[PDB]
Amino acid sequence: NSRTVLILCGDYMEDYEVMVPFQALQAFGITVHTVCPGKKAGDSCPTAVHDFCGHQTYFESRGHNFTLNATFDEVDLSKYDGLVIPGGRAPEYLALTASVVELVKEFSRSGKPIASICHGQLILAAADTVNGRKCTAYATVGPSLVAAGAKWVEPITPDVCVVDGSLITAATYEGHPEFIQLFVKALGGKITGANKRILFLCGDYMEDYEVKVPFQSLQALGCQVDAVCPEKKAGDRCPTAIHDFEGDQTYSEKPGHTFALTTNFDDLVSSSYDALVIPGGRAPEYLALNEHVLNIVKEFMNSEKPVASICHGQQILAAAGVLKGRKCTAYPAVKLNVVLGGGTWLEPDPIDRCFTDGNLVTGAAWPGHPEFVSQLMALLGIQVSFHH
Amino acid sequence: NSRTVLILCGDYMEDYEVMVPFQALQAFGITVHTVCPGKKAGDSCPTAVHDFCGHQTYFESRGHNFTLNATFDEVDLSKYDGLVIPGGRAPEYLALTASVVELVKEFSRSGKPIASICHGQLILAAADTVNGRKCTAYATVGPSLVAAGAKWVEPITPDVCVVDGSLITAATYEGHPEFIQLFVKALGGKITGANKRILFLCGDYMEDYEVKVPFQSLQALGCQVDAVCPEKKAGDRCPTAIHDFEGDQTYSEKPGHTFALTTNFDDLVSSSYDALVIPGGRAPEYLALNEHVLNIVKEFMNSEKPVASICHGQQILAAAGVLKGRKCTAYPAVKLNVVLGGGTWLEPDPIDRCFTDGNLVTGAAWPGHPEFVSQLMALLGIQVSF
Amino acid sequence: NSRTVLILCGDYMEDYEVMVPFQALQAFGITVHTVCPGKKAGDSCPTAVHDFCGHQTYFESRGHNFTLNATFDEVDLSKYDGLVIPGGRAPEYLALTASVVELVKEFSRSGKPIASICHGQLILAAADTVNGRKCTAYATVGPSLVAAGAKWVEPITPDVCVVDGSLITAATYEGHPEFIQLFVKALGGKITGANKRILFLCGDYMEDYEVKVPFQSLQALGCQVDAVCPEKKAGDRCPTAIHDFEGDQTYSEKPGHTFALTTNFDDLVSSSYDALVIPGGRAPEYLALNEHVLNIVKEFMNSEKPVASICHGQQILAAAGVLKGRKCTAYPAVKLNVVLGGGTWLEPDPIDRCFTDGNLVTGAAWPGHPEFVSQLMALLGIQVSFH
């Protein structure tokens, strides 16, 4: 609305590092444009899934293909208030692209906020814009930054964020919450009403974006967000599924990042939470069989606390019988579940559209995260205002 | 002949759930047509491999591409005696396809047999054809079926099957045997001579379809079928290979479903078995080096008991020396092993054809399962009559 | 020139089995041409990665696409001194290709050296060229070779090699060193000065080709080569990455073969080695943060011992501060690290070109292995000559 941000994309950029800020910022009322040198709006970029399993370094597999909404060659920097540089393997080649270094230098020269994460900083080193600047980055980027005159800050923990003037840097996607918050503040944003506790009902193979994006978006606002899964405790990990449309009549599926739970399902007081969020994917169909899970849903629905479910997440609500006389959307196929549950179907067209029915916010698929998070924020009374 | 069945296919339907019934029913003498809305005969559908690693739910990877043989838009329900609905991720979107719902609704009201498995039942719930009907399905489909008025039967075991009038249902592909048997009976079929015991020589990376289809087709008839692998015991698993042609000069390979052995190889006694079956893939080349395996083959051959080998499986027969002066086919490349083994080659043209030379049934690749199984049935005196 | 060799390729041939000899032989001064029936120079063949991961047989995934540099239908056998037959799944179908069988029969008849490995021998059986010939092969090929009249040598271990006159055979890529050495000898080649010890700085996700090709090429010469990785001991393995360009703005990545370390990093005495090699991939970026790794590099540089680094390997050199005032190339993107490191950039054009600056040999990507190994051989004083 009152702010416009540009995201510098590239092939094999880290999937979370482009999508989380892309949708979170939009959810907060910021217009976001994505560009990649040599590509135009509508074109796609493959992404990389960099997971920290158990090797001496991260493992890589392919993530969701990312569709650009802007044309690099037609970029007018005077129209942008901030720049975001995702990590992944795109930075190393983007850093050697003349037009890219030029763009970053021009932006850095203006004093406008630049949020760079993980390997994204390689581009700042190439643009020679870190001399004497305090900054962190993925640990392996340290040598290059030091060589470029930076006041390097070794990331002691994966969530470390550093700030120098309007230059905001992070080491990994685990720092997204503070990373994004600092960027929003840098853009003159003021966050209010974020003192809330949110519970996420997770499970094996929930959709990769659908758990991470809303989870980190809410944490970025300052909310306390917990993730639980039956039979699993804090620290345990849940594998995720990347659902993407690649030309066939339905989506394809491949592994996403493993997601770490934060709270024990057993020791869980639902009355201690202000809202419930249900990621989509394949976890909902089996979680819907867990009576304890259904009880939690019924409680929030009865207490009339905000409940946000997306895509297949609605399968749990239907099983809980809390959809009778309620209006909501869901993944197209899930219409069966909604209608069978006694609910009123709302057509998810466009696919990124979300709906609010009293305390219930529903989305259809990951493209709808901006409205999903935005509408949940409205119900929780959380606001981001650009008045500073 | 005598019976014609329609299989409601879709993108990412479970690979075993479409291929096992497609080939088993054909082996039994039933004409089977496969269709997918929006696609025509000759088009292909990607399939999903759903394996249960004891995790909270299944893991998915891609299976063989499946080639449809009929056109959805040209379908005339009056021609079909029965309908089969595979599971996987196709059902959820097919259930929201108007043309599909209409087809299922009409078929249901016609009273003809419908065999739906795992997630396939979602389409039945969408077509509102299960009210008051007893049925099972993959556990997670229970809520939808209950909401649709079904008399839900919780699947207590992976192989649980239910038959209630014209409706036959199963929970997972592990229930294929009884699932298909019940469907055949519903079509008015009578299976005779199936009281036989068959041995499968398995190994790591045998072809995904080549072990599962023949194995479950024979179980569907009512045969007791055992699977063994040297150095492994009952309960142990063997990874499998999915071989598909995707444009290059030879086939590609990716992971298939893990296959569970049922018997200990060391306690095995050939005299107890009526027939021997050898799946193809990459297991045969190393199994052919095991003298115990070669000894087993020699015993069956000398007893003149039925021996059915497909695709690369013939490498074991060649090494055993039992192809000397015998006629057979195999995977095209395996002609080398056959001829060097002293055998006479029979060209597999078309590729889905099989041959029998006395007690020896041979096939060339997975498309040949229908004739592979039907010819083994002939040697065993097993028949399906309508 | 001096010697020219033809490599019989096919779809899904084993990646190591085609690339190692292709690049090692070139490093040794041999002109190598690669062909596949039905394909022309410039066309590519998919390759297979066959890994032995504890199953009763090997596991397979897809490797790098291999680009042929010759046209099968235009092959003039009189121009070739030797023939190499890679293994994998290509041999089974190549063996049923009439044109291929005709080619092999004629070459075998000429009496020229033929080096066949693993499953490649299936083609020899089909060509009926093993009767009375002593040979080994992947164990599963034994029955067919015996049936074909071969004097079969069951491989007691994966590295077993056999030579019977003009026929050189191996069972798996683990036998590449002796396999290639024997073939070079068969071509009338002589190796001198190979009594050297080489140390490889390995790590998780290092590039599959960049570790295996130089490692086995050096072993083929007769060198004692060891590989180490921090926190790992001999016998432990490192997963590798296969980097290939498939149409996007940067390379793709998928799993390669797992690579076995041969010595304990923690008990290492680098001073006992004559040269150091640094494979590329994603290992260098994290290895560059290990002071122990940096110390090994500094030791070799200070002693002015031969150091060969390729592609991203140079990230370690930059972090060790040993590129100040030195001339070198690296993976294009790594130019950033090199320049920031204080070095003089040498453009990698063509991409298979390598450069030598005193004791430092640098390459930019796996296509440069021939010059990479050849220039390291020069610093080490290792020569390969043909009568």
- Is C332's CB within 8 Å of A139's CB? no
Asked if residue B134 lies in contact with residue B164, where contact means CB atoms within 8 angstroms, the answer is yes
Q: Specify which residues B278 forms β-bridges with.
A: B309
C96 touches chain B (CB under 8 A): yes
* Residue of chain A whose Cα is closest to the Cα of C339: A147
Q: To the nearest 5 percent, what fractions of chain B are helix, strand and coil?
A: 35, 25, 40
- Is C143's CB within 8 Å of B319's CB? yes
Query: Residue B216 corresponds to which tokens in the numbers above?
Result: 């479950």
How does DSSP classify residue A210? H
List A residues 331-350 in contact with B (Cβ-Cβ < 8 A): 332-337, 340-341
Helix (H/G/I), strand (E/B), else coil: B105:
helix
A318 touches chain B (CB under 8 A): yes
* Residue of chain C whose Cα is closest to the Cα of A90: C250
C57 touches chain B (CB under 8 A): yes
User: Mind giving me the DSSP string for C69-88?
Assistant: -S-GGG--GGG-SEEEE--B
Q: What is the CA radius of gyration of chain C?
A: 20
Distance CA(C164)–CA(C147), nearest Å, equals 18
* Residue of chain A whose Cα is closest to the Cα of C338: A144
Question: Of A190, A207, A236, which residue constitutes the final position of a domain?
Answer: A190
Q: What is the resolution of this structure in A?
A: 1.6
C50 with C124, same domain: the answer is yes
C365 with C229, same domain: the answer is yes
User: Mind giving me the DSSP string for A114-155?
Assistant: EEEETTTHHHHHHTT--TT-EE---GGGHHHHHHTT-EE---
With 0-12 / 13-18 / 19 or more C-beta atoms within 10 angstroms meaning exposed / middle / buried, residue A263 is middle
- Is A140's CB within 8 Å of C336's CB? no
Helix (H/G/I), strand (E/B), else coil: A331:
coil
A227 with A312, same domain: the answer is yes
Helix (H/G/I), strand (E/B), else coil: A275:
strand
Q: Which domain, by its residues, includes B16?
A: 1-190
* Residue of chain C whose Cα is closest to the Cα of A9: C249
The sign of the dihedral angle between the CA atoms of A116, A121, A125, A131 is: positive
B304 Rama sector, left if φ>0, alpha if ψ -120 to 50, beta otherwise: left
C205 touches chain A (CB under 8 A): yes
Question: Of A147, A164, A190, which residue constitutes the final position of a domain?
Answer: A190
Distance CA(A39)–CA(A48), nearest Å, equals 18
Angle at B290 between CA B284 and CA B296, to 5 degrees: 85
Asked if residue A216 lies in contact with residue A181, where contact means CB atoms within 8 angstroms, the answer is no
Give me the residue from A10, A11, A125 closest to C336, CB to CB.
Answer: A125
Distance CA(C35)–CA(A349), nearest Å, equals 53
Asked if residue C142 lies in contact with residue B289, where contact means CB atoms within 8 angstroms, the answer is yes
* Cβ neighbours, 10 Å, residue B143: 24
Give me the residue from A12, A122, A126 closest to C250, CB to CB.
Answer: A12
Instruction: Match 């696609």 to its residue by tokens.
Output: B39
Query: Residue B369 corresponds to which tokens in the numbers above?
Result: 């399962």
Q: Specify which residues A85 forms β-bridges with.
A: A116
Residues with Cβ < 8 Å from C155, sequence gap 6 or more?
C136, C137, C138, C139, C171, C172
Distance CA(C188)–CA(C112), nearest Å, equals 11
- Is B336's CB within 8 Å of C90's CB? no
Distance CA(C276)–CA(C270), nearest Å, equals 9
Question: Number of C-alpha atoms within 13 angstroms, CB side, residue C36?
Answer: 26
What type of residue sits at position B46? P
B173 with B213, same domain: the answer is no
Count of domains in chain B?
A: 2
Helix (H/G/I), strand (E/B), else coil: C218:
helix
Q: How far is CA A114 from CA A124, A158, A186, A217, C281, in A?
A: 10, 20, 9, 19, 29
Residues with Cβ < 8 Å from C207, sequence gap 6 or more?
C240, C241, C242, C243, C256, C279, C280, C281, C311, C312, C366
C146 with C218, same domain: the answer is no
Question: Of B162, B190, B218, which residue constitutes the final position of a domain?
Answer: B190
Distance CA(B290)–CA(B134), nearest Å, equals 49
Judging contacts by C-beta atoms under 8 Å, the chain A residues touching residue C265 are none
C56 touches chain B (CB under 8 A): yes
B258 with B373, same domain: the answer is yes
Burial C190-210 (b: 16+ CB within 10 A, else e): ebeebebebbbbbbbbbbbbb
Burial C6-37 (b: 16+ CB within 10 A, else e): bbbbbbbbbbbbbbbbbbbbbbbbbebbbbbb
Q: Specify which residues A385 forms β-bridges with.
A: A190
Instruction: Match 């396809």 to its residue by tokens.
Output: B97
Asked if residue C204 lies in contact with residue C359, where contact means CB atoms within 8 angstroms, the answer is no
Asked if residue C204 lies in contact with residue A56, where contact means CB atoms within 8 angstroms, the answer is yes
Q: What is the helix (H) or strand (E) element at residue B102, kind and residue range?
A: helix B98-109
Q: How far is CA B328 from CA B27, B201, B342, in A?
A: 20, 19, 11
- Is C56's CB within 8 Å of B229's CB? yes
B205 touches chain C (CB under 8 A): yes
With 0-12 / 13-18 / 19 or more C-beta atoms within 10 angstroms meaning exposed / middle / buried, residue A388 is exposed
A93 with A142, same domain: the answer is yes
Q: How far is CA B321 from CA B177, B231, B295, in A?
A: 34, 23, 11
A135 with A227, same domain: the answer is no
Is B311 a residue of the active site?
A: yes
Distance CA(A310)–CA(C157), nearest Å, equals 56
- Is B12's CB within 8 Å of A248's CB? yes
Question: What stretches of B1-137 adopt beta strand conformation (E)?
Answer: 4-8, 13-14, 31-35, 44-45, 47-51, 59-62, 66-67, 82-85, 114-117, 134-135
Asked if residue A56 lies in contact with residue C228, where contact means CB atoms within 8 angstroms, the answer is no
Distance CA(C190)–CA(B54), nearest Å, equals 58
Nearest partner of A355 among A342, A341, A338, judged by Cα: A338
B280 with B254, same domain: the answer is yes
Task: Please state how this structure was obtained.
Answer: X-ray
What's the residue count for chain B? Answer: 386
C230 touches chain A (CB under 8 A): yes
Residues with Cβ < 8 Å from C238, sequence gap 6 or more?
C202, C203, C204, C205, C206, C229, C232, C258, C259, C261, C283
B241 with B371, same domain: the answer is yes
B231 with B112, same domain: the answer is no
Q: What is the CA radius of gyration of chain B?
A: 20
- Is C333's CB within 8 Å of A95's CB? yes
Instruction: Please provide the distance, in angstroms rounded to a whole number, between the alpha carbons at the two ends of chain A.
Output: 15
Write phi, then psi, for B223 (nearest 5 degrees). -75, 155
Is B176 a residue of the active site?
A: no
Q: Specify which residues C60 forms β-bridges with.
A: C50
What's the gap between Cα A118 and its chain centre?
Answer: 15
Catalytic residue, candidates B9, B238, B311, B328: B311
Judging contacts by C-beta atoms under 8 Å, the chain A residues touching residue B152 are none
Judging contacts by C-beta atoms under 8 Å, the chain A residues touching residue B96 are 332-333, 335-336
B225 with B292, same domain: the answer is yes
Q: Find the CATH number of the domain harbouring B279.
A: 3.40.50.880
Helix (H/G/I), strand (E/B), else coil: B228:
strand
Residues with Cβ < 8 Å from C46, sequence gap 6 or more?
B248, B252, C11, C12, C62, C63, C65, C66
User: Mind giving me the DSSP string for B244-307?
Assistant: E--SSSS-EEEE---EE--S-TTT--GGG-SEEEE--BSHHHHHTT-HHHHHHHHHHHHTT--E
